[PDB]
Ligand binder design. Structure first.
Ligand code: RXU
Ligand code: RXU
Ligand code: CL
Lengths: 305, 305
């Protein structure tokens, strides 16, 4: 029993974290085989950030202008190239701790673990989700850029996020490991803001199924709803539309508990229209949306890595 | 910016997890140097739990009755002894991945990271606190026994918890790494139950200081309180008594924000009386008590917004 926001074991990623320093800027890099991946803004000063021409800033740099430190060992940069908003530093040493890995681009609603780093040294691990507005609600201070997000499937690390910046509301924006931003953000000091966010409906439903699995059943009722009527209600509370794909994905949880997806949608409709009335679900007074259907199944089954 | 329940990077602990098998029982062990530490109930059957005589069950076992597996390698047991509720298995191989470590017994209110494991393989990492009633609100299924709790201040791992059991309310009980239980719990299937739990007051105060540091003051008021009057109010809400030690410990957070401890106590009294009135503090609609003053200082910016 129990239900916690659980992150993946971070060891396979800790062995890839390095410090990258170019000029007066210092941030984190991901060292996989003989390449170190880091945000391209490592080549920028504060004034450059206002309107940077990255290709022009990069051409003026040599390999010895980049200082890469892995623990207390200095790695030698022997090549450099840019791919979208990510700088790729070719180093003379392959990482002996390189795990089996893939670079994957995630969709909004999907969760991942973040290994927060400062000066190439990991400080903490936490779980979060890609919001519908493509921002993440992370915990990052200055020096955290280059921190990565990932998931694990058996022995393989799927790197999905690299930290680049913080928006005015305190939320975070970054890229996949190919340097493509999530959301309409650009890597420069210009007016940028998170769009209006919505609640990840399929994730709230998965967390309601987790509450039922753990013994919390007060919100269940005799009623059902159509998918269209549920979406008409959800749209009014800034909840994401629930699709037939979402109902299919909730199937295993609908089978383990004996509660149909539309049966559970009628419970969420009542919670949206009445609130919790002084009660909690899994120790929370808010409807939680940062656990996917897969996270619920994995935590209520004991999947190992 | 941001504030998350953050766990320590688990890599140093992942390299110590092994599988211990005795007869038909299989659980987790912690391999440090040439010793594997695991719960002594690994030598018990389900019937043995009603009234186990551990000394009598242990004397009938030889070294080769214990199967220790580290990854896909079988370790050889060359000695066994019992220390309180833990079994210590002397193995012929020292763990080459043994980190710098200490065994520390924690007090109620203190937090730690848990690396949940099944069959010697880590599955997830989450943060939690030793409750005032000496239980933890973990997430553990059958096969998780022997999973450990730890802190990693500097490069040293301080092991503080080993998982042994789940109580009727779904909370968890275990020992320090010397085999001494936290709480009046026994590794016997008795009518033991978790005592009435209370809120960790010093931790709620620390989290209110974190909210102020992150730029939020809506909950503050122009009032102050004596320590005794605050405790008379707090105990009516099942909050732990706040001691002068707790006041001293909150000093740095009080200095960084300019808000006196007894003035933050007055905001807490008012929040208990009024609720949040549709507002949240650091993304939560409940008063959070699983962040110590030390965790807030570790995570938050040294500069108040
Ligand atoms: C909040 N941002 C700023 O004050 C200026 N920022 C311009 C800027 C412009 C484009 C890009 Cl791609 C990055 C950046 C910076 C680089 C570092 N960074 C950042 C990242 N994570 C967390 C925190 C920060 C800044 C201090 C608060 C915590 C940014 O957003 C800095
Ligand atoms: C709920 N308790 C039981 O079913 C019987 N349990 C008596 C018992 C009595 C004393 C001791 Cl020290 C151990 C134990 C067991 C050993 C394993 N275990 C356990 C541990 N963590 C999580 C979960 C469990 C059981 C299934 C639910 C998840 C226990 O409590 C077994
Ligand atoms: Cl302590």
């Amino acid at each position: 029993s129990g239900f916690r926001k659980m992150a993946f074991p971070s060891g396979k990623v800790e062995g890839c974290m390095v410090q990258v320093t170019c000029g007066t800027t210092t941030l984190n890099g991901l060292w996989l085989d003989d390449v170190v991946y880091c945000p391209r803004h490592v080549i920028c000063t504060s004034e450059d950030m206002l309107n940077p021409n990255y290709e022009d800033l990069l051409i003026r740099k040599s390999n010895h202008n980049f200082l890469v430190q892995a623990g207390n060992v200095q790695l030698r940069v022997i090549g450099h190239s840019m791919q979208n908003c990510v700088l790729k530093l070719k180093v003379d040493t392959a990482n002996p701790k390189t795990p089996k890995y893939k670079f994957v681009r995630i969709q909004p609603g999907q969760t991942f673990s973040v290994l927060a780093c400062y000066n190439g040294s990991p400080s903490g691990v936490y779980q979060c989700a890609m919001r519908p507005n493509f921002t993440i609600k992370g915990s990052f201070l200055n020096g955290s850029c280059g921190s990565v997000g990932f998931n694990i499937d058996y022995d393989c690390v799927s790197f999905c996020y690299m930290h680049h910046m913080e928006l005015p509301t305190g939320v975070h924006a970054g890229t996949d490991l190919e340097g493509n931003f999530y959301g309409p953000f650009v890597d420069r000091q210009t007016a940028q803001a998170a769009g209006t966010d919505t609640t990840i409906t399929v994730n709230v439903l998965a967390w309601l199924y987790a509450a039922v699995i753990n013994g919390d059943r007060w919100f269940l009722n005799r009623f059902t709803t159509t998918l269209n009527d549920f979406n008409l209600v959800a749209m009014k509370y800034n909840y994401e539309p629930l699709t037939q794909d979402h109902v299919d994905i909730l199937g295993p949880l609908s089978a383990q508990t004996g509660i149909a997806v539309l049966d559970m949608c009628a419970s969420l409709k009542e919670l949206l229209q009445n609130g919790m009335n002084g009660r909690t679900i899994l120790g929370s007074a808010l409807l939680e949306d940062e656990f996917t259907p897969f996270d619920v199944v994995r935590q209520c089954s004991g999947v190992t890595f």
